[PDB]
Amino acid sequence: ADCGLRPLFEKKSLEDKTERELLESYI
Amino acid sequence: IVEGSDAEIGMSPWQVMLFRKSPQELLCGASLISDRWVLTAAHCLLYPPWDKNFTENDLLVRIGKHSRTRYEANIEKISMLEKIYIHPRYNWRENLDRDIALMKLKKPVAFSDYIHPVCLPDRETAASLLQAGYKGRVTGWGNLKETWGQPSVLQVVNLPIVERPVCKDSTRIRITDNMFCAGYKPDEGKRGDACEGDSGGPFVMKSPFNNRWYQMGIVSWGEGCDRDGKYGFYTHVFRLKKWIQKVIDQF
Ligand SMILES: *[C@@H]1O[C@H](CO)[C@@H](O)[C@H](O)[C@H]1NC(C)=O
Ligand code: NA
Numbered sequence: 001a002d003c004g005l006r007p008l009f010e011k012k013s014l015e016d017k018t019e020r021e022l023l024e025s026y027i
Numbered sequence: 028i029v030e031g032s033d034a035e036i037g038m039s040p041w042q043v044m045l046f047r048k049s050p051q052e053l054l055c056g057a058s059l060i061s062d063r064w065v066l067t068a069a070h071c072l073l074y075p076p077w078d079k080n081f082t083e084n085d086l087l088v089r090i091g092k093h094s095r096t097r098y099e100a101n102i103e104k105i106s107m108l109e110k111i112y113i114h115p116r117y118n119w120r121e122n123l124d125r126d127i128a129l130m131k132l133k134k135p136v137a138f139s140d141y142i143h144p145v146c147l148p149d150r151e152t153a154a155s156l157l158q159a160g161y162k163g164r165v166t167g168w169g170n171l172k173e174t175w176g177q178p179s180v181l182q183v184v185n186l187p188i189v190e191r192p193v194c195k196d197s198t199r200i201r202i203t204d205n206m207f208c209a210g211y212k213p214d215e216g217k218r219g220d221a222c223e224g225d226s227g228g229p230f231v232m233k234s235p236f237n238n239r240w241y242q243m244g245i246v247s248w249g250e251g252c253d254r255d256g257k258y259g260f261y262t263h264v265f266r267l268k269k270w271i272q273k274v275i276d277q278f
Binding site: 003004005006007008009010016017018019021022023025026 | 032035036037038040060061078124139140141143144145146147160161162163164185186232233234235237238240241261
């Protein structure tokens with residue numbers, strides 16, 4: 001249902017230190 | 028995790044620690060998929076070449092952990108195991124094909140800022156995300172190197188998915204369709220890989236459409252740790268989602 005959404009991150013619109021590296025590997 | 032860094036608090040709320048009741052010992056990693064189920068590798072619970080073959084009573088599941096050793100009262104939850112489900116087609120004899128196992132908790136766990144389930148992948152998620160070049164994240168309390176050592180905090184590392192050709196002829200071991208490998212190529216520069224203690228842990232990817240994390244794989248095996256021309260192999264979660272839904276819906 002509510003899976004994959006981190007209370008301390010996605011739930012608060014804050015990104016962790018390296019998730020961006022991941023989102024970029026898609027280019 | 029080799030060449031990784033400390034995980035931020037709550038960075039991997041689904042990270043699970045498989046603990047041996049007696050003698051006290053960190054066996055493997057695992058993942059919280061619901062308030063009742065934990066996913067992990069099959070060789071963690073059963074592998075006779077090492078005479079490893081536990082039964083519920085032998086193990087405990089520690090959730091919400093950050094520290095490897097310390098018992099973090101009020102943050103981490105410890106749960107007992109009701110039943111252990113190992114894939115019937117699991118093959119350790121040859122190459123650990125279909126390396127997967129589910130564990131039902133005796134009592135459901137309450138979610139928190141530190142305890143949250145990860146999403147399993149679906150056809151759309153797999154086709155879309157399991158592409159060579161695309162990066163995934165691996166976490167764990169496993170050793171920091173092939174030899175020595177151990178981290179004091181959960182370790183995290185991001186790794187690129189490697190094309191099946193490169194994987195297949197990167198080892199003398201038979202690579203099946205239930206497996207996928209990931210890691211940096213010898214020349215790319217960057218390094219990293221899981222290692223002893225990380226087995227059974229998650230390899231997650233973050234969807235670019237909904238911001239949700241999906242566990243695409245389980246740390247399965249590798250020849251050594253962070254060796255050049257080598258790669259870590261992960262259980263292809265989706266490829267086995269049928270078995271998962273089977274036992275979850277049936278049990
Ligand atoms: C693991 O132990 C169980 C009994 O708890 C046994 O039924 C199973 O045969 C063992 N697996 C083997 C020995 O392959
Ligand atoms: Na490597």
